[PDB]
Write a protein that binds this ligand. Structure first.
Ligand SMILES: [Cl-]
Length: 163
């Protein structure tokens, strides 16, 4: 209905994460940023942004392209939850930093859903602002076994913020 859950993906795991979140929270629409516009973004007041990290801290390409047509005023009057995917073992110094590029614009808004850096093993990530990850962080390469627990707790954490 009215929560817009925007994903971008090369592997498909971000779409499957978006759908899991959508089933959990309810009243959402799941939309591929590859097929979406500034117009579409602004047809929601509340959003969850699901973006995997590509290479050493870049944003997945579709997300990069889409974010490029949005400016910070497109976020300021919205509630925003971010969901990053990353691989803490391979990219310990740039872990799930994909979402940070989204955060550089989205932090104008009401960003909700920050999570504890606890339970992840890594040295650095710009995804971390003021002691917390800016969003939910999933690592399907190394902690695929924690992904459902994580989504469940995160939805309980933000569900009230989404209305
Ligand atoms: Cl993905």
């Amino acid at each position: 209905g009215k929560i817009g859950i925007f994903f971008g993906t090369d592997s498909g795991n971000a779409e499957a994460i978006a759908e899991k979140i959508s089933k959990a929270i309810g009243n959402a629409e799941v939309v591929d940023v590859a097929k979406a516009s500034k117009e579409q973004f602004n047809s929601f007041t509340k959003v969850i942004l699901v973006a995997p990290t590509a290479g050493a801290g870049d944003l997945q390409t579709d997300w990069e392209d889409f974010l490029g047509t949005l400016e910070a005023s497109d976020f300021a009057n919205k509630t925003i939850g971010l969901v990053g995917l990353g691989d803490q073992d391979t990219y310990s110094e740039t872990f799930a930093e994909g979402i940070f590029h989204i955060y550089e614009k989205a932090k104008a808004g009401k960003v909700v859903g920050q999570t504890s850096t606890d339970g992840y093993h890594f040295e650095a990530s710009k995804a971390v602002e003021g002691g917390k990850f800016v969003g939910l962080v999933i690592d399907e390469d190394n902690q695929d076994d924690l992904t459902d627990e994580r989504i469940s707790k995160w939805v309980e954490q933000v569900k009230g913020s989404f209305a």
